[PDB]
Amino acid sequence: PLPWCPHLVAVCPIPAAGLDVTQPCGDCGTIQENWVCLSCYQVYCGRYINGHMLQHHGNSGHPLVLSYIDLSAWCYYCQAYVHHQALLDVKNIAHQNKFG
């Protein structure tokens, strides 16, 4: 992945509620291929289901999203995966919820 991108500044503090990697899409309710937005922590489905996270990027401009399938982080502006120290806390909290 890229070691940095100019949109990491838009990653917001993790809710005290934590993350639920089984949360469904906020628009269509699917349990498949969901992502969480790292700006406002809403959950929406991926490009191969109904494309609601791409729609959320378009209507909010929020840049960076985390996959509940593989814990990768994608930037919609850079069109690339990113890994950085600024993403470790959210990835680690998601890993703990997913795997125990």
Ligand SMILES: Cc1n[nH]c(=O)nc1Nc1ccc(C(C)C)cc1
């Ligand atoms: C996460 C993601 N979202 N949109 C997209 O167009 N591509 C994405 N992933 C992706 C995975 C593999 C590759 C390879 C073929 C270089 C490219 C993009």
Ligand code: NA
């Ligand atoms: Na589809």
Ligand SMILES: [Zn+2]
């Ligand atoms: Zn959806």
Ligand SMILES: [Zn+2]
């Ligand atoms: Zn968002």
Ligand SMILES: [Zn+2]
């Ligand atoms: Zn970026």
